[PDB]
Write a protein that binds this ligand. Structure first.
Ligand SMILES: [Cl-]
Ligand SMILES: [Cl-]
Lengths: 179, 179
């Protein structure tokens, strides 16, 4: 029995807490496999979009919109959508959906909760969602009003939003980050 | 290292074995919660579609198509698509996709594998897929070329294919089958 406004006054937790459909759900504990893919994924995206100020990928950033407050594993925002203070530095609060959300499964994660979170992002303007399953070496690709797409062939390139089109990431390259 | 033709010559297992993307994957072990929803779900669908020979819901029926051989928890076929022998009785082999596939999660089930199986059905003519998550009291609804839809409000009706439009099943009714 808690509202979003009430939830946002509460202190941060480790792992972070999400406010989904009126419920407070704590994110899963960090795991080796999860961290390896997460850190390398942010690094590879930013190497492609950050130099020419196209976009920026953020680790564990809180996104509050559409009566939910979530913490995607990776949130990617195009430059024009990054909220900034008057001095030009990035704002502490993000009240908008990412342009590209990336979720990586870990043993204690709820795949149903993650899928709902990705679909909620798409409902509020997200261009693309990625659901990475390390165990199955699979990526589910989510686009607004389109059937979920499956990528699991080692040589297959995983689609990226058009602002990140210079990124050519194969399934084999992604899951090699576990090695 | 096995083909579909070779796989189909092999003996049946308990739990049943599926042939997906050239791999043999055994279904999860039966569980109480899973069986309660599965048995009641087949009963409720057939009470709506079997009397007027609209369709028929089958438990654990093997469906072999598009180089895969799967065993959906529940397969629903419209009357005109039920394969029949010369004498008019239902055939032992189904070489086509169900009109409606229903998958119910259980503790050892791979939600990624199930989603791939539902999406493979849609690629070969299935009208609708249901992914029931008893633990999260959620139903994911899959339609060809449409974004996945989420149903989790207790009073919400879960969509059904138009041949089964007389079925009005709420989320609360579905998960009450666990009580
Ligand atoms: Cl910046
Ligand atoms: Cl999906």
């Amino acid at each position: 029995p808690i509202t979003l406004d009430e939830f946002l006054k509460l202190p941060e937790t480790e792992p972070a807490s999400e406010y989904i459909e009126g419920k407070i759900i704590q994110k899963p504990m960090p795991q080796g496999k999860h961290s390896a893919i997460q850190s390398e994924c942010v690094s590879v995206i930013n190497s492609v979009v950050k130099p020419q100020r196209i976009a920026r990928a953020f680790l564990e950033l809180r996104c509050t919109f559409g009566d939910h407050s979530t913490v995607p594993d990776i949130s990617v925002f195009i430059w024009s959508r990054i909220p900034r203070e008057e001095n030009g530095e990035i704002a502490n609060i993000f009240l908008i959906a990412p342009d590209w959300t990336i979720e990586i499964l870990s043993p204690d994660q709820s795949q149903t909760k993650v899928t709902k979170n990705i679909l909620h992002c798409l409902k509020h303007g997200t261009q693309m969602g990625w659901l990475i399953d390390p165990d199955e070496q699979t990526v589910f690709v989510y686009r607004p009003q389109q059937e979920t797409e499956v990528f699991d062939e080692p040589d297959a390139l995983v689609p990226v939003p058009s602002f990140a089109s210079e990124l050519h990431l194969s399934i084999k390259d992604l899951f090699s980050w576990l090695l």
